[PDB]
Amino acid sequence: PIVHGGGITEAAARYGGRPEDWLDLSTGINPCPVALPAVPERAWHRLPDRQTVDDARSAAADYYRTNGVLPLPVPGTQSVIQLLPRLAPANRHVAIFGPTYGEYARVLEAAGFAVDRVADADALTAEHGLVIVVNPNNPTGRALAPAELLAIAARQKASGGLLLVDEAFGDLEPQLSVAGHASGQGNLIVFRSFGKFFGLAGLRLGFVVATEPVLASFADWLGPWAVSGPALTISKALMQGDTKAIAAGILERRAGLDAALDGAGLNRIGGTGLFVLVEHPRAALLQERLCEAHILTRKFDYAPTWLRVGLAPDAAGDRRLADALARMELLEH
Amino acid sequence: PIVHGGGITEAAARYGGRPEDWLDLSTGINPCPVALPAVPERAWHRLPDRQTVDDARSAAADYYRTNGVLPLPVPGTQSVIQLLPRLAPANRHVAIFGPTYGEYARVLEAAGFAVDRVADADALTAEHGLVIVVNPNNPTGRALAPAELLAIAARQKASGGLLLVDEAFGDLEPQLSVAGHASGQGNLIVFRSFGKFFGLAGLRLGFVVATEPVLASFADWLGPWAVSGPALTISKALMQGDTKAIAAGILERRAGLDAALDGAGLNRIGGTGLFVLVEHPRAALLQERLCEAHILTRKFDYAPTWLRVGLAPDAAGDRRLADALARMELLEH
Ligand SMILES: [Cl-]
Ligand SMILES: [Cl-]
Ligand SMILES: [Cl-]
Ligand SMILES: [Cl-]
Ligand SMILES: [Cl-]
Ligand SMILES: [Cl-]
Ligand SMILES: [Cl-]
Ligand SMILES: [Cl-]
Ligand code: NA
């Protein structure tokens, strides 16, 4: 399997300490979780009712500005990633803009698809029945403009190709979103994530924006009661609340992280509101040394000079990171 | 799709009333939800950690008496039903003891398997690569003894067949369970459900008990972070608590339902602690008339004389049902 960010259990087992003493900078989750809305006993007790679902879907249509399309709630983005083998044309390649989140290639290659890693729209052909872009990208933060994405979609449509845009990290940049273009474009699918922006990744919740035939396919494949009642209640309440304050809080924490990393002499080469990509010639060794300080960060086997650093919850965490960098022992083995 | 129990949204739309005024007797959920344990902010905020998972798995191993096998948490039983097409031998039939929960046949036939409906172990052959028994059965409550199940498993093993036992309704009858026999039997898989017994079906949580190769297959197919952090926290706490009082409460509510149904002159032909199966020559019309009283019950297109009635939450609900039966208008259209 892929070693995703968030592995505090394994890190604390390997490097010591109690998990709650660790500073976890290895994910892209909002470090300051929004306050929980009320969840009535009924929502805990009953199989999730159609009304609970529909309320969540209307709230999501408003929040993601989907131009009337009701997004489909799904139990976490992984659950629909794993259904992409049923939607992608089976005798065509899949083009993935990368380097990116590795579950797309893992899932599609396990299902026997040929996956082409690409970086530019210029590498896209009619052999690509599905094109995947994480926008903005994880882990580089690269952002394609809406018009580039729609031009990609239009070019693939001529051969019956689909474009999937995973906007997991797009809540801070609503002007990049193509979630309003599903009806007009026709061959466009958008994934949205709930846990990262709202800081409640303990819930497993995502949304799909697509045409009705495609949404009906996803619904059928996922089966009844796929998404928990609490998740649907919480996302309705929070999407109807004040998300501007959430975004402003995130940007404040990101300014704090920038100052810590810059003041430590590290080279920031990308990121989003929720994480920074650092390049350093001994990045893997930096990750290990930070672990020895009980600070977890994300490294990548395919990019030995990359380190992805998520936000700290407060200025004391920023300073904890800076001090660990300043006091770190030789970067040799 | 199948019209499962719990459809209060649709019923209230068709027959009027506010959903919270309806008496929902159309499911098999414990009508008296257990009190919620504490869920620390950390469990809401973080992607579900390996430690949270492992704690839930150890609690489930103790609670289901699995003889050392760590059950795999899954996001609701439907999520592993939908993976049965990947586990069943692809060029063999599937035998399903029925009439039963219809998702097994729906999922397996959608995947191109030939499904044989059976009622007796005597109809089982080597052509059956997978045999499915819901035990005790939904909706009849039929119970096979552990020794009959193990004899079925042993007979299928000779041809490399698997036996799946869905013990969704087995928490009240722990002496029927074969969840302790996975290592010794080798070709046995057990599904357990969380929402029904504990009355918290808003959470989507089940467990799989199987050999390690099979559990590792399910884990890989489900992908990372499949089960919510709150669900895993709650099930650990509640499985370690006092489940005897939960069972006793359920049996009290079931005695109340029996008295209501018997005193109304209805013929009970089966059930479990969590529901009663009634036979009546105009069952479908009874279901419609109860809907007119804003009481929802479960009918079946394949059994026009069957009505499944779940528990009411209190004696006032029992009396509401009895009065609706006593005052109901002509059972003709
Ligand atoms: Cl230690
Ligand atoms: Cl809109
Ligand atoms: Cl991502
Ligand atoms: Cl458009
Ligand atoms: Cl009304
Ligand atoms: Cl045991
Ligand atoms: Cl069932
Ligand atoms: Cl045994
Ligand atoms: Na949940």
Q: Are residues B131 and B236 in the same domain?
A: yes
Q: Check if A43 contacts B (Cβ < 8 Å).
A: yes
Q: Are residues B265 and B142 in the same domain?
A: no
Number of domains in chain A: 2
Residue B333: inside a domain: no
Report yes or no: B39 and B32 within 8 Å, Cβ to Cβ. Answer: no
Given the DSSP bridges, would you call strands A303-310 and A128-134 parallel, antiparallel or unpaired? unpaired
3-state helix, strand, coil in chain A (%, to 5): 40, 20, 40
Q: Are residues A19 and A167 in the same domain?
A: no
Which of residues 135 through 164 in chain B touch A, CB cutoff 8 A? none
* Interchain pair A51, B231: CB under 8 A: no
- Element at A84 (helix H, strand E): helix A84-87
Range of the domain at A190: 41-240
3-state secondary structure A229-244: HHHHHHHHHHHHCCHH
* Interchain pair B24, A46: CB under 8 A: yes
- End-of-domain residue from the set B196, B219, B240: B240
The span from the CA of B23 to the CA of B21, in Å, is 7
Ligand nearest the Cα of residue A188 is 4
In the numeric block, which tokens belong to residue B19? 């959903």
CA B170 to chain CA centroid, Å, is 8
The span from the CA of B28 to the CA of B169, in Å, is 8
Residue B148: inside a domain: yes
User: Which CATH number do you get for residue A200?
Assistant: 3.40.640.10
- Element at A304 (helix H, strand E): strand A303-310
Q: Are residues B207 and B270 in the same domain?
A: no
Residue B76: inside a domain: yes
Q: Who's near B295: CB < 8 A, 6+ residues apart?
A: B22, B23, B25, B320, B321, B324
Ligand nearest the Cα of residue A4 is 3
Backbone region of residue B302 per phi and psi (left: phi > 0; alpha: psi in -120 to 50; beta: other values)? alpha
Distances (CA, A) of A63 to A37, A71, A199, A244, B100: 17, 10, 17, 12, 41
User: How close is the nearest chain B Cα to the Cα of A38, in Å?
Assistant: 14
Report yes or no: B6 and B24 within 8 Å, Cβ to Cβ. Answer: yes
User: How close is the nearest chain B Cα to the Cα of A171, in Å?
Assistant: 17
* Interchain pair B46, A6: CB under 8 A: yes
* Interchain pair B227, A204: CB under 8 A: yes
**Partner-chain residue, chosen from A6, A41, A203, that has the shortest CB–CB distance to B228:** A203
Tokens 């009290």 map to which residue? B252
The span from the CA of A192 to the CA of B78, in Å, is 23
Provide the CB-side half-sphere exposure for B49 (13 A, CA). Answer: 22
Report yes or no: A56 and A226 within 8 Å, Cβ to Cβ. Answer: no
> Sheet holding A72-74: strands in order across?
A72-74, A206-209, A188-193, A162-166, A128-134, A93-97, A115-118
Closest residue, chain A, to B30 (C-alpha): A45
Measured N-to-C along each axis, helices B50-63 and B229-240 cross at an angle, to the nearest 10 degrees, of 30
If one counts every other C-beta atom within 10 angstroms of the C-beta of residue A330, the result is: 8
Experimental method: X-ray
Residue A33: inside a domain: no
Identify the burial level of A106 via C-beta atoms within 10 angstroms of its C-beta, where 0-12 means exposed, 13-18 middle and 19 or more buried. Answer: middle
**Partner-chain residue, chosen from A51, A78, A195, that has the shortest CB–CB distance to B224:** A78
Q: Are residues A199 and A292 in the same domain?
A: no
The span from the CA of A37 to the CA of B16, in Å, is 29
- Counting DSSP H helices and E strands in chain A, the numbers are 14, 13
Q: Are residues B50 and B162 in the same domain?
A: yes
The experimental resolution of this structure, in angstroms, equals 2.2
Q: Are residues B66 and B118 in the same domain?
A: yes
> Sheet holding B275-279: strands in order across?
B267-272, B275-279, B303-310, B298-300
Q: Check if A206 contacts B (Cβ < 8 Å).
A: no
Smallest CA-to-CA distance from B168 within B270, B44, B81, B266 is with B81
Report how far ligand 7's centroid is from the alpha carbon of B3 (Å). 13
Closest residue, chain A, to B51 (C-alpha): A9
Q: Are residues B206 and B275 in the same domain?
A: no
The span from the CA of B133 to the CA of B144, in Å, is 9
Smallest CA-to-CA distance from A321 within A257, A275, A271, A249 is with A257
CA B294 to chain CA centroid, Å, is 24
Identify the burial level of A134 via C-beta atoms within 10 angstroms of its C-beta, where 0-12 means exposed, 13-18 middle and 19 or more buried. Answer: buried
In the numeric block, which tokens belong to residue B130? 């997978």
Smallest CA-to-CA distance from A168 within A76, A300, A66 is with A76
Smallest CA-to-CA distance from A180 within A158, A204, A149 is with A149
Residue A3: inside a domain: no
**Partner-chain residue, chosen from A19, A46, A195, that has the shortest CB–CB distance to B201:** A46
Residue B127: inside a domain: yes
- End-of-domain residue from the set A240, A256, A290: A240
Smallest CA-to-CA distance from A143 within A106, A112, A172, A115 is with A172
Residue B268: inside a domain: yes
Closest residue, chain A, to B2 (C-alpha): A224
User: Which CATH number do you get for residue B311?
Assistant: 3.90.1150.10
Residue A57: inside a domain: yes
Closest residue, chain A, to B19 (C-alpha): A51
Q: Are residues A163 and A264 in the same domain?
A: no
User: How close is the nearest chain A Cα to the Cα of B118, in Å?
Assistant: 25
- End-of-domain residue from the set B240, B274, B292: B240
Report yes or no: A107 and A82 within 8 Å, Cβ to Cβ. Answer: yes
Q: Are residues B134 and B195 in the same domain?
A: yes
Q: Are residues A185 and A90 in the same domain?
A: yes
CB pairs under 8 A between A and B: 151
Residue type, position A318, single letter: D
* Interchain pair B9, A46: CB under 8 A: no
In the numeric block, which tokens belong to residue B293? 């009283």
Q: Are residues B63 and B185 in the same domain?
A: yes
Which of residues 227 through 286 in chain B touch A, CB cutoff 8 A? 227-231
Distances (CA, A) of B279 to A238, B268, B283, B299: 46, 6, 7, 11
